[PDB]
A paper describes a structure:
An ABC transporter is a critical component of the Mla pathway, which is a phospholipid transport system that is important for outer membrane (OM) integrity in many Gram-negative species, and has been implicated in the Maintenance of outer membrane Lipid Asymmetry. Here we report structures of the MlaFB complex, and present a model for how these two proteins may work together.
At the core of the MlaF2B2 complex is an MlaF homodimer, assembled in a ‘head-to-tail’ arrangement similar to the NBDs of other ABC transporters in the dimeric state.
Residue numbers in the entry:
A (entry chain A), B (entry chain A): 5 to 268
C (entry chain B), D (entry chain B): -1 to 97
The structure:
Amino acid sequence: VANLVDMRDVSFTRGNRCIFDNISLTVPRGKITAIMGPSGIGKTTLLRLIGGQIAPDHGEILFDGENIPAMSRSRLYTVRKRMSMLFQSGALFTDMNVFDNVAYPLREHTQLPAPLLHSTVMMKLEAVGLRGAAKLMPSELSGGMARRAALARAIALEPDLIMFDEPFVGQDPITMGVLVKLISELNSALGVTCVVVSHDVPEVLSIADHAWILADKKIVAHGSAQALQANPDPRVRQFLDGIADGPVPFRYPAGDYHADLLPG
Amino acid sequence: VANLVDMRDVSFTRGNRCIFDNISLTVPRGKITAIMGPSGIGKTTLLRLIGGQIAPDHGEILFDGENIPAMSRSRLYTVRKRMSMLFQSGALFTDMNVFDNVAYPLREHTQLPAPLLHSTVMMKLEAVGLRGAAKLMPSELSGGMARRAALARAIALEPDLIMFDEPFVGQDPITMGVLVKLISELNSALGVTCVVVSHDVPEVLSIADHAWILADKKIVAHGSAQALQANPDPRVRQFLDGIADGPVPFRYPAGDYHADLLPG
Amino acid sequence: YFQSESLSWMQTGDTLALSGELDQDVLLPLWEMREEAVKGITCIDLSRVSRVDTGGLALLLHLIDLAKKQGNNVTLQGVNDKVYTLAKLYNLPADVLPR
Amino acid sequence: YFQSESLSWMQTGDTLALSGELDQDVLLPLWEMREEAVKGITCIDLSRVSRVDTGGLALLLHLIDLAKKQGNNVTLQGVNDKVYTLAKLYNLPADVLPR
Ligand SMILES: Nc1ncnc2c1ncn2[C@@H]1O[C@H](COP(=O)(O)OP(=O)(O)O)[C@@H](O)[C@H]1O
Ligand SMILES: Nc1ncnc2c1ncn2[C@@H]1O[C@H](COP(=O)(O)OP(=O)(O)O)[C@@H](O)[C@H]1O
Ligand SMILES: [Mg+2]
Ligand SMILES: [Mg+2]
Ligand SMILES: [Mg+2]
């Protein structure tokens, strides 16, 4: 396959309001794909559709060629093991140290020998620069240091697809710069397929191989980073550059100003 | 006075750990002042010290020349009315519309006549571009639209000092760009004094007249935006540019790598 | 040392001259005499005002409008730079406030 | 259509040649015979390996170290480009892995 995830004319509706109007989206495997758009569009919804926790009203979501909504419960349970939605809950066991956390997946779900398993966790802790924190607990971990340990445990089983849901929010530029380089490093080395939802547009486009912009229940524009930042389109340019006024008006439609100031 | 807030050798300690080691900080009135630093340094703490909800162990916090910790409870209650800590709770009454929210402060705490009060709220709703939403409720308000209505009600009484605690987090560049221009517009027009804590370094330095960077219980460096972004200092440059490795190491101190890989 | 505020207005023929501070604490005496102070007038002279807050500008707009309802177009003369900055913030059109 | 994996190793004099895929599913037979396969050897030839995962590289490091404990320095010959990319990710020094 060329595209690990392939959405085909996908519509999704909650209650009275429609969130997606047959969207069709592509995630090529081995490359970093970015999802962007205003708050409330359905970015988190779109991720849970790929994961199988929710099913679309119409369309098909093909992971590695296999349609997720039509999967058996036994098959969806196993296919989901190739996925990892990062910075969820669970993430780290609170009763064991950092090494035991990253080692826990391989200790059970692989039959690799013990001395090689030990060296494997040491290497992956060095990947996120937390080898010195191997005996620390999540109690003591910093803000950013905790999320790097979650990333380490996520890639412990080396899944095929990793999904980040606004991973940079509330982070200083040093903490953010580390996690941006980390994601880009694990992609260019392990070949893991990454989907990144974020509002930090300049940072995510620096490592993305393909990006998507959503507005009004539909896809506004896609393409590469260089192709997008050179795209001259008012509604694309207003979002990528963060301009106060554009096709998304700064001013709510109000009517006649003079009458609102001076009535009777 | 030249500085609306003037902190003089201020130390603050919680439990076993020290947060501030006699810091001395300046907020010149009429200008925008930015506070930056890693998560957990005490930015929110520093704001509550200016507000009076917490008192320092040592030092003095002079608002308009008057020391806040030494104020009477009757005096601190009145002095705080000249302040506004924005995007707190309360912000908007949930049982009245947008116009009634922004009008509520003047309807009681000013004895301005009624037809002029009505025109005043209409103008201030136009300032944040929500004049068309005057009859809407906070129930219906968007994410960013709600925070603009809070800003409108905050400047309704025209306080002397406004404090924003990470106001841009979780915001798309359009929503953020609006709030950045709004803050800069209200400062250059009403002359309101603004303190802005944020991690979005490029956006906040575009409107700040003076900035501060904190690390290790102390002030690392201050100065203007042009003075800071041209400051060649590794620990200042690593933070302002968001570089993964620098005086803040990406790698936790670990010891000998070869032994951790190959023991016995 | 001394920071007292006052607001005064004198009508000379067809021109009304305001002088002092045009703000919230002192504007009430003019608003209560709004219809009597502006209806012989066809030009408002903010030449001699030093300070204008948002409420005082709202009073100015109502004064301009009261003269418009009479039927004579009115001029705005001598407006300070900061007042126009405030008007630009509130997007005040050419109707409510001449430039 | 066919995607079978295997791992083989042949020692020729002083050089050990690995060929196949060096990954998690097929590395066990070599680790169980690690001390017997590397101790007549002073050079490991990844010339003929096509795929190396993180666990297989860990096996390679232990194979290199087992030969170091004997007392003869060992060469690394024919390593694929992607393996070195993996080593650079894990910051593997010159001790554990010659370049
Ligand atoms: N259980 C629900 N019932 C009704 N509407 C919902 C429900 N869950 C989500 N929504 C709406 O659908 C949209 C889903 O947004 P979400 O998936 O959170 O996207 P994002 O993470 O980009 O904000 C939101 O606007 C929300 O208002
Ligand atoms: N009640 C408390 N007891 C002990 N430590 C506290 C308490 N409140 C805050 N702290 C610590 O003091 C610091 C205050 O940080 P805060 O004011 O939230 O700064 P910021 O908003 O920049 O993170 C935090 O690191 C926190 O761990
Ligand atoms: Mg989300
Ligand atoms: Mg940014
Ligand atoms: Mg904070």
